[PDB]
Symmetry: D3
Subunit: 275 residues, 6 copies
């Protein structure tokens, strides 16, 4: 008995799709400050890759997206249950990968970071399903964990196995990672209306729903999206019109600029500390 082809199928399929390598680029860009050996960097890149693949496999299912990068999703080639099983086993694979790093504290780092990531994802799922619009503070503290959790996990693990010296700069890099994840989430939200069908809240939408508590048209359109399975294109342009009248797209520009200013200042401070 040497067959493990119905368990590794979805993982290989999702790993065969094209990607931008943002996490690999982040690992490489953090390696200048923390001079690490090559094989450790390859191990960290592998861990990040498989964790991202598992997250994508789960999110495809939980968002009912027939297409991923123009190509078919994993659950339309293998089924929902097999994809769920493979995603569950990917956690054990990342477990063996982290075990191979020869560091007892990477254990606790991995476990705590996964706990935070799951908390964030649970809050996002509750808000999406129950149709409850969160506040700006709640939404922004959600995306510090759901999206910035991977960056914080990789940063802490990278700092742990770095050669001594670079130990007091963990907090600076953790703050940088949180700001970076916030920037990615807000950028995604922006380049999705000026470019969801499953009633996903966004940064532009919260401002519109808060500054206008009496706007019944937007709320009714969102309710139709909820109890319809999605919106048609003419119903979609109405949401864009409402957001553009409420001035939420510029409110997103303000946040984008503030986050980039914070990123630039953090990077400048980190370069000043090191060198």
């Amino acid at each position: 008995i040497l067959g493990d082809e119905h368990l590794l199928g979805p993982a290989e399929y999702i790993s065969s799709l094209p990607s931008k390598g943002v996490r690999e680029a982040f690992i490489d860009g953090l390696n200048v400050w923390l001079v690490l050996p090559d094989h450790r960097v390859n191990q960290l890149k592998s861990i990040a890759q498989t964790l991202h693949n598992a997250s994508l496999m789960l999110d495809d299912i939980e968002d009912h997206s027939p297409l991923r990068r123009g190509r078919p999703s994993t659950h339309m080639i293998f089924g929902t249950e097999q994809t769920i099983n493979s995603a569950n086993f990917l956690l054990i694979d990342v477990m063996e990968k982290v075990r191979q790093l020869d560091d007892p504290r990477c254990m606790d780092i991995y476990l705590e970071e996964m706990r935070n990531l799951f908390i964030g994802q649970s809050f996002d799922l509750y808000w999406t399903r129950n149709g409850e619009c969160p506040s700006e503070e709640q939404y922004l503290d959600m995306i510090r964990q759901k999206t910035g959790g991977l960056f914080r996990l990789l940063t802490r693990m990278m700092v742990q196995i770095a050669p001594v010296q670079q130990k007091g700069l963990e907090t600076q890099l953790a703050s940088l990672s949180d700001v970076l994840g916030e920037f990615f989430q807000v950028r995604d939200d922006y380049k999705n209306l000026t470019e969801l069908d499953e009633c996903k809240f966004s940064y532009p939408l919260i401002h519109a729903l808060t500054s206008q508590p009496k706007n019944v048209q937007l709320r009714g359109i969102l309710q139709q999206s909820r109890s319809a399975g999605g919106l048609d294109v003419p119903l979609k342009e109405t949401v864009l019109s409402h957001l553009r009248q409420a001035g939420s797209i510029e409110y997103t520009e303000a946040k984008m600029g503030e986050l980039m200013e914070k990123i630039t200042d953090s990077v400048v401070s980190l370069e000043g500390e090191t060198g």
Copy 2:
């Protein structure tokens, strides 16, 4: 501030349900041969309970079961996505518990038997999706990992923390765990049959399909179940009648008796030396 109300909701709901507790009884029975402190036994009981709860939560979404033990399933109270999120987090939660047993080898054991469990469940899911009837050996090898995986996982950790002396009692206990896992699945198939909707293969239904290669009615009802999504009572009666013509029920009785003979022999051999 920090409540974790939407993460632990499904876990608490499924943990607040009635249960038979076969895993806890197995642990307590093993504790006689391998003398252990209460603290370690309770830790292992918690680990087994959490793993069983996660497995139960996952196999209701994958089987489309509206009810469990007469009560509504977890995904009908919280949602499919939230239940999946909690089930995956429970794996990490147990991961933090195997680490508190103070043994590096326990994590290896965990990481190997979880792999075996996932392989078995993947094969079961593939046979359910694509209606491919496995051989009897294939089915028995699947259920030696899908169902006996928990028992083996608990057994190999208990001998690792067992105080010195008893160390050669490893192969016999593993064989006992595998035979118990096989018996507990043949028994469930027999009880479910003699007392379909998801079109899941069973031990009698493989013998029926193998001994009768030209039974078109059975193969057609099995496909109507798959396509329509479920079988009405008259169709279930037709399947049950087709299964008595091939003598599949007696074939299940014989396998149950043969398995129980192995269990008795294993117990007598283990109690002979210790």
Copy 3:
């Protein structure tokens, strides 16, 4: 490549319990027509196969999940396989018809099959479009659709009949039509007194004709047409609407009138023979 997938549905529907009206009718005719024993069994085989094919097609065309409290053929083998088996059954019945050593039997078979299909086509058109037929139209449709098998069997038995049996052609055919009409009226009475697809019946036509402005009945019938079936309270409402108009007594009167004709025809045939 055998016929496991071709004779599956036919063998399944043959295995199911049945009543045996056709075989009893053949045996009853054999008293007058004194056929040899082998030919009687051949005709019973033909009648059984034709009836089984008709039931197989009607189950699909009426969306009936059950037959005699047992799963229907197309819920075990599928719609396409059942249609293919029903077509092969028609192909097979004639190979038996050609074994009766009579060229005229083929002509009889072909003409009565044409009549069968015409009647069934009118039934299907009335059901799909929701158009209520008149009394004469419905009576002719049930005279061809249900009385056609009896006619076919009667004419073949008279052709095979040993010599004589010259004038026993119009009387026996009229008896066949009357029996086929009576069976349909009796089934229509039974299915209602003690379906979901809004199938027109003798009680329903009288109600829809005698009451030109009964909006409630037509609305319930259209609800059955659209939703796909009548729940229990709507069925009770329809039955109350039928009791109000007196359709049940009309059906009883029609049954009695038909049985009078059956009795008179039997007495006449007994008188000559």
Copy 4:
């Protein structure tokens, strides 16, 4: 009642649609060798037309095809029940036409050939519904019976009708008809692929599933087709790419060439014992 109008409705609608006259071409082609009178030729052509119309009318129902030759199918204008009824009556009509050929053996030929046609159809339906992949030999036999059945029936009736003399060239023409029907089916399978929706097995698909008994992606896509009752375009492109990766499109062009060589040799042989 005497109006036979709800019975011939579908039969005339399917006849009004455009066609290609392959069966008429076959009859003209064999008439050079068998030289039988003109009215018999018209009778045989009408029999072939009616049988083909009935087969198409039933196929369109059994394959859930909303369109036929661009125009709507028969069951979308008259309903499934009426279409089935008309297709059932068309057999009896063809049967009335056969008896006018004035030959008792013609009825025997017709009754024996329709049995093979129905056996082939039954195997096709069983393989389609149950999702069971046939072997190459079984598929070739099925398409030899299902598709070559009409050609075999016509060519066996033609020799019986044709003026005595020529009687020994019956087996040769039957082999020619079987090869021609197999060629037609393989050509249709290749064209539909290069230029499956209702889970139909083809010649390239069997080769793909047999050469690689580990490709879980192809099997999963085939399953998804069954579950959803059809395939989307990105999903179909994946199947086409998988087939082109296994060399099935060339394994089909080899079979087509072999069949054409067999057809040419059969025609040459049949032209050497006539003239």
Copy 5:
């Protein structure tokens, strides 16, 4: 040209078993106001037509297959025909009100219809969007929706009343509002102890307000919204959740206070009338 297809849905719901709360209320008020039988019958017809139109619209807007154990109007005539008939019923009532020989009755009718529709609009918004109203909001909604007809009839009866009974306006209006609140709370209690369209109620509002972290109840309410209603095991779970927070006792308390107010108002009116 010949009516029908318009009055048919109206006649179907008119010829159905009823209770007659509105008619009894009119007869009870006539003791204090004393109106000729002609006017009383006119008001009774107006009330019957208004109640029937409200029921026809509510059955459509709640997807109720049955009413009083008999099929609903829209299940015999279709949604569109029922809507058209209910619309024409308002014009018909507008014709009856014009026959009371008073221009002020028309103003009363037009100013109570607006309140009725405002309350119904808030109910529809809360039902569709899943928003949970506050106790004050819910009690203000049912004071206009269910207490609208009682107030409308009351204010017409005191305008036609002979010997212009001075005052007897505010007291009777308050009596109508408290009766309308009592009837809705009573119906809410009866439906629970003795939803499928996800309608809110006093016990459910109390349960959702007292326990802001009960994720199970909110999840079940969301499941009701998604899959078009609940099932018996899930309704039992909701009932068990409501008996833990003391919602039923809260409903008894509200019912008792409402009945005390009714008794006090009635005795106050009887003291001055005699």
Copy 6:
């Protein structure tokens, strides 16, 4: 609480979509003969606008049309129940506008006209639901009330408000309004065909079904529309071809020419009476 947010939500939305002002132009047209003060004309225009908005709100629901003038429909933003409630209350709104005209005979004209409007709508709905083809006369009477009711109502109110000297016209103007409504309905029927997805009976379709009792294809396509829910485009071309072969379009432009001739004669007579 002030309220009036979920009541005047669909009414304001339907009043914001672009319109053509046919009924406002009609009101201005008759104001030349009936010299009325400006504010009385504005009141009548408000009444007509709100009545038309309520009718459109109701009609969109009974036709399951997701789009109105390209923009999303009212029941796709507020739901069916809320739109029904607002349309119900719009009648009570037109009530006070009519009462503000200061004329006891205008509350009477209103009720009788709305009764005929509802009778016509009821017949339209019954024919649409229970698959019943009306005759030519029944269809013409139904469209004289369903469509010409608003014109008659506005005309009678305008005559009542106008000075007593110009009150002998009425009849003339009422006949003009009936012919105008018939022309509008026939124009819409012609334009929806030249340019049954809800199985609606039009003027050409009644002729097509009446002049051809034995045409089974048209009735089958209509029943397919009834059952499935709508007609695909290849099925629409079949209906169009059947109508063209039946010569039903020329019947329609003959009807339009006759109606325009009647309108011209009526206007000429009305100008001859006045002046």
